[PDB]
């Protein structure tokens with residue numbers, strides 16, 4: 001057995017409870033054996049993995065090491081076993097998917113504002129650092145016992161870059177959970193950017209009132225149908241040049257639909273500014289879709305009641 | 314943290330290998346040879362000079378923790394290169410790296426039947442080694458190289474395509490020949506390379522109008538005393554290296 005100064009055995013942590021049975025890899029809550037510090041353990045899956053240590057895990061590790069921000073989950077260290085490998089994270093008490101699916105739990109407009117503010121701030125940070133999260137959803141948003149929101153699960157995340165030379169980036173199209181997946185991807189885009197994360201932000205924002213994912217497609221075509229029933233239908237008038245995916249034709253998307261975003265959500269949301277912001281997040285053309293910087297500036301965050309702390313709950 | 318992979322000269326004398334009886338001079342070679350094996354394989358695997366440089370740094374750092382007496386450079390280089398290619402996004406296949414490493418180390422010898430037990434063993438050995446490297450480096454795999462900094466600096470001082478190419482050359486050779494990577498931040502090494510390339514080309518960078526020397530635009534810590542001490546050390550080993558200087562020698 002061999003010198004290993006910088007890679008501690010995960011046995012330093014004491015397992016308390018599984019908390020991720022069906023969400024990607026197994027996730028454990030655990031306790032530092034000396035200090036009691038609560039952490040989250042994620043084992044790195046090795047299901048062939050006929051190519052040594054997963055290139056996918058290297059990517060995530062690289063990205064977690066780069067990202068250091070109040071609204072991004074914090075990778076403490078990586079542990080071995082004596083054989084397996086574990087990502088060790090600071091523990092977060094709540095998960096937005098959980099809080100939202102809990103009838104007991106209640107949000108004021110003021111808190112919802114705060115949540116969206118932290119989330120958008122996290123996105124601004126990761127994007128500013130050339131990272132696309134690619135898996136925006138309620139379940140990937142955590143909140144600490146002290147009401148700090150953290151973006152989590154960078155397992156599908158990837159660095160991105162700008163242009164260039166009129167040679168398009170060829171990123172993977174198979175990204176983002178179906179319900180949260182933006183139009184671009186569904187129409188076959190491989191040269192996409194930060195706007196895909198913001199579409200997801202939209203879906204989550206709406207979900208803060210509806211308490212449920214606004215568009216629950218079963219397949220890509222069903223998803224594209226649902227999106228059209230809400231945001232109008234994909235038109236080169238609405239979305240300049242959309243007509244040029246080899247999937248524009250094949251999709252045979254609906255064409256009577258007209259934008260119902262504010263009408264269909266009008267019920268739950270009520271607040272004019274909230275509805276306006278959500279509307280500008282769920283925009284069809286990625287290039288006309290609001291960015292995190294403008295979103296943070298939106299009157300929603302600068303009118304009464306001003307955003308407040310997450311007290312109680 | 315920040316001073317984790319930078320060592321004092323005194324620390325370099327007391328390396329894991331010394332501890333096991335390997336002379337300082339001997340150890341140095343061991344390093345230069347690993348860097349050579351990396352460069353050779355990397356070129357045949359058709360990976361970038363950047364990826365090769367990454368595996369070299371991995372190797373340098375690896376041997377500040379492990380000893381050459383326990384882990385031979387011919388074992389580590391392939392694993393290191395295999396890892397660096399995955400990290401730099403030029404992934405090469407495990408079976409492919411094995412093949413290329415085999416021909417390098419054993420030109421005459423014949424590759425084992427991929428069906429064999431002996432071959433299955435070496436596949437498994439590479440994977441085990443990659444894991445020992447990951448853990449020795451404590452999963453710190455993002456490497457800053459002098460080259461980034463060279464380019465920037467040599468543009469700002471309007472060096473000829475030639476001067477700039479020579480500086481990039483010095484940068485690459487500092488990795489193969491020296492332990493500068495274990496001692497000096499990349500930006501400082503970049504200054505050392507640009508300085509030497511100037512000396513070698515008879516080029517002089519004009520003192521800015523503020524009376525600031527170029528390297529001051531590059532790193533606060535850097536001084537001419539340091540630069541001359543370092544360019545000298547680097548030039549000396551280049552002189553020992555057969556044919557290396559020939560490559561940048563003005564034959565006219």
Ligand SMILES: CNc1nc(C)c(-c2nc(Nc3cccc(N4CCCNCC4)c3)ncc2C#N)s1
Nearest residue numbers: 019023027040042073089091092093094095139153
């Ligand atoms: C989505 N995958 C995840 N990986 C990690 C390591 C997560 C994580 N989770 C927590 N705490 C926490 C609290 C309550 C619920 C949950 N889960 C169950 C419900 C849906 N599935 C995932 C969330 C998790 N704290 C820190 C991290 C991190 N990193 S989540």
